[PDB]
């Protein structure tokens, strides 16, 4: 659905068409003016950073494996007449239907006998997810991935690809799969009983030599050397595929390029009356395009055990019953062209669509994970209470776009109750400690790290124990529309911390709440503190992320008694553009102002600039008014002339309209 | 159901997240002030009670089994309609909380020759009420098998008797065969050989009745604990964690306290032990059995309606020693030679060192209130905060005074044992010696110590009136008509573990009111009799 993934987007961001995409790395987020101020009884000290970057990395690497499962029956396409008045295939009028056509008459008797069983295989989702995924590898195909390369650094901890991905070799995108081709036959009309467990499929005219190739390809095992997100392992779909097309299937040609594939996709949903199947196809890949780079060293154990995701067994009776689909179609919803047609227009805005997606969804999932189990709506019993329809199975798009729901704060409606694509809530559920691989860079690191040893030499590989699960993004699309406590992302913010001249400095926390908005206040005024718990003996420090620059409380990596002593004469000034707290005496007063948003994005240390024409907002409207117009010009060619008006030269002449 | 048992702890205590149990024993209770007020025909004397420690004892042994039984499905094309009538995981979630206390607290151990209940003159060991037992820790108790859990892949045809939803799974389905009696490693029959890869809020209560178990306040309250009770475990089909141990304290207390009342009901009235809860519940389970017989106790107790969304018949059934017409034989050892005189035994001669029987026909209180303290008082318990005891002093003739009402020597008796006076009374129609210094834990005197359903008059020995505790109000001599006025205050909670204190770390409303279960409470009206309790509707 292109509308519902629309509106999440943020209203001051207007996106163009084409994004040259040259690497496996993006740092999307947005230019603000901060106006910071430190209120004192000494006096006032002004701040202000005319443009401050806050960014969430995202990659295109993340560890998936298909499973071929059993899913509903999409009925959107067949003809409106064989239907009932409830919405159900009245077996009767299909016999009606089947005898009053061009069929031959001997195979009418043995066909509609089949019909029971052929006609309830509608789902072409996993054909269409395959050949969306050929568009985008061959499109961004020069993109690498380096073996000993660095998946998350922070200065204290490092992780490796080498760590998270083993059997990994260093190829580039186009150079990763080597798909062989399936056999694409040609449907006999003149067949005695139709063969199930063998889809066939509808053509427009003739199959041509480089839709024999994508068809082919589609239909295959996804085998893939480098583990990248949009040709991760896939099952093989079918062996062989029918094709009921009176022009013969031209033999594969081999080559192809990223055009073709839409070329391909067009004739296919047109002939098979099948955009419900392709609307279905588009949120199951703006799911599992991108994959977010972890915020913190400890949130990597979002992406340790890969997630399975759910493909539809293939299953189409089309070839058959060639009579059944015609120009009237029944659907449910009017709106249900919407979704091909924004595609075929934007076919890059999908990655626009996906950032929104993944986004939303793991930042409910960080305060998600924060709940007891005795509640009413908790960890395991979120997904049932919110759905109020009758999937097969709560997993895929249903637990993705429940989340979306939560976030936003709106009403989700999908026309049927498709149960299919990535589950995520897999390392929550389970409810277990995790063992995070990580590579030690000082000798002072399990301090900070809750690690499994307590000494430590430079280059030893370790292990992290994560109990709780930190939050894997910082809310920036989803900034300040529906704003909770815990990420604090107002646009107005103040702290009051109350110290006497008695105390040198050193000022104890009791209260978690206004600890964790000091800790992030001082790190946007680019100032380096280092707290120390007094009950159990740790140490946290607010730079502990170069994306975001907020504290969130889970960078404590402790759930106990909160008693946090910081010395105010420890302070050291990191960044710049930063106000300096010299020597502080009485009550303390900080606090900010966020005015204006510019969208901004980074690539290879360089600004990524969008380019092309101005994307709109395509309704059903907008085309069938050109219907209604129908350009009703009667085409005559009717010529029109120019008098010739004379004026002082002569020499040269000089045409007039009337 | 966390926001129910929660609210039966008392308002003044609100514990902490952990507790580090370190033993298969834990006291639990209060330090209270009583501030004593003293007159009769001689004169006038006040005293104060600085510091008194109230408590019960609970333990982690409890001799249990689990059957497996057919109960309704929680609601929270030919296939789908046989197999969704049939839904309910609380079975697995069970054995799953079990696995999780079974790793926590496992260094808990239980040795055969230590005592269970020991009071001075009797004695019960482990070996009794627990033969075929070996010394092992909690952890050595249970060597658990595996069962297969295979990946469901395209299959059309779901496989019967199969569930569809490692090392956690494949245990938590296998059998249970423990080797020493502990509560939260009972036996437990197969749940299912495979497994394709509110049903918790069921398994949550249905573990804080098995948790704990109590340990008797008196030798005669064995009996409750001798036959093993049966835990309903559900058919397996589908297509703060230590804040559970005061919630199981609450649970146990509340049920125990009132089946204390439900035993002295006469079997001739509207309500009695055998029609108590099918008058109480308001719903259509498939038994009044399990969670349905708890929550009716607890209901009764707290003088609430509670009400759960589904009508769950799963759990441990306790009321089984209470409904059979037979005296109960409580194995005992004899420690001092004059046993007989005090305890109804089978041989009247014995020697220290003996196994004889003791007789059990009415079933006497196993526990005393504690948590539920004054939140609805009895005459019988008599756990008020604020109380003006009167009764009037029967003449002493030689040193002996004849108490020929039931009523007055349950009130003189209770005051006696205020002021701190070990007072030793001889029953006539048996002749058989009671002490109101029966229960040292808890510093009150129930009637049910006589250990004699029936009627009776006592003969109390005047002279020979011991002094184990004196306060300034305490007096020996009484004259006339005795007025005693106390007043308790400064309740703090304290528990007690291998005798050392054991510290704290850390739009509109669709009634839908026809298939959700409800229960409603009774109120005990007192009457002449003071034996006899009777229930009515309030």
New interface residues.
């Given amino acids: 659905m292109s509308s519902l993934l629309n509106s999440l987007l943020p209203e001051y961001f207007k996106p163009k068409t084409n994004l040259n995409i040259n690497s496996s790395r993006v740092q999307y987020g947005f230019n603000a003016r901060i106006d910071m101020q430190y209120e004192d009884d000494s006096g006032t000290r002004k701040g202000s950073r005319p443009n401050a970057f806050m960014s969430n990395t995202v990659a295109f690497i993340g560890n998936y494996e298909g499973?071929?499962?059993?899913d509903i029956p999409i009925l959107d396409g067949l003809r409106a007449d064989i239907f009932d008045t409830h919405g159900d295939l009245d077996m009767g009028l299909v016999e009606d239907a089947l005898s009053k056509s061009t069929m031959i008459r001997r195979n009418v008797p043995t066909y509609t006998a089949y019909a029971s069983e052929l006609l309830y295989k509608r789902n072409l989702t996993s054909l269409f997810y395959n050949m969306l995924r050929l568009y985008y590898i061959k499109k961004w195909g020069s993109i690498k991935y380096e073996k000993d390369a660095i998946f998350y650094d922070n200065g204290h901890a490092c992780l490796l690809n080498r760590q998270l991905f083993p059997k990994s070799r260093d190829a580039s995108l186009e150079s990763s799969l080597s798909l062989p081709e399936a056999e694409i036959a040609m449907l006999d009309p003149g067949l005695e009983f139709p063969e199930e467990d063998v889809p066939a499929i509808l053509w427009h005219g003739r199959v041509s030599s480089r839709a024999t190739c994508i068809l082919g390809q589609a239909c295959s095992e996804f085998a893939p050397l480098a583990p990248f997100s949009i040709a991760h392992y896939s099952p093989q779909l079918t062996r062989k595929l029918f094709v009921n097309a009176p022009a013969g299937i031209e033999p594969s040609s081999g080559r192809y390029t990223h055009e073709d594939v839409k070329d391909a996709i067009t004739i296919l949903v047109s002939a098979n009356q099948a955009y419900t199947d392709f609307e279905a196809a588009y949120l199951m890949l703006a799911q599992t395009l991108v994959s977010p780079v972890p915020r913190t060293a400890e949130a990597s154990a979002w992406f340790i055990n890969a997630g399975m995701v759910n493909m539809p067994?293939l299953s189409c009776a089309n070839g058959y019953y060639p009579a059944l689909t015609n120009v009237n179609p029944y659907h449910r919803l009017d709106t249900w062209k919407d979704t091909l047609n924004h595609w075929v227009a934007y076919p890059d805005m999908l990655f626009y669509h996906s950032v929104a997606m993944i986004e939303s969804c793991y930042v409910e999932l960080g305060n998600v994970a924060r709940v007891?189990?005795?509640d009413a709506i908790n960890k395991?019993?979120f997904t049932?209470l919110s759905v109020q329809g009758r999937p097969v199975m709560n997993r895929g798009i249903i637990v993705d776009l429940t989340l979306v729901a939560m976030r936003t704060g709106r009403e989700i409606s999908l026309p049927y109750p498709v149960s299919c694509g990535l589950t995520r809530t897999d390392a929550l559920l389970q409810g277990t400690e995790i063992h995070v691989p990580v590579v030690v860079k000082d000798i002072d690191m399990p301090q900070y790290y809750n690690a499994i040893d307590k000494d430590v030499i430079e280059g030893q590989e370790t292990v992290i124990k994560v109990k709780q699960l930190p939050p894997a993004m910082y809310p920036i699309y989803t900034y300040g529309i529906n704003t909770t406590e815990f990420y604090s992302d107002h646009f107005e913010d103040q702290v009051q911390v109350e110290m006497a001249p008695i105390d040198n400095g050193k000022a104890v926390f009791n209260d978690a709440r206004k600890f964790s908005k000091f800790m992030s206040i001082m790190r946007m005024m680019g100032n380096d503190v280092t707290a120390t718990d007094l009950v159990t003996g740790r140490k946290v420090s607010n730079w502990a992320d170069n994306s975001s620059g907020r504290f969130l409380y889970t960078d404590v990596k402790y759930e106990?008694?909160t008693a946090f002593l910081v010395d105010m004469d420890t302070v050291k000034a990191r960044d710049h553009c930063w106000v300096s707290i010299v020597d502080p005496n009485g009550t303390m007063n900080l606090s900010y102002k966020m005015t204006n948003f510019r969208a901004a994005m980074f690539s290879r240390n360089k600004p990524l600039y969008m380019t092309g024409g101005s994307v709109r907002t395509i309704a059903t409207g907008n085309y069938r008014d050109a219907a209604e117009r129908l350009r009703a010009m009667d085409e005559t060619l009717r010529l029109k002339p120019f008098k010739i008006t004379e004026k002082l030269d002569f020499r040269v002449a000089a045409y007039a309209i009337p």
């Fill in positions: 499973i071929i499962v059993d067994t007891s189990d005795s395991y019993t049932e106990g008694q």
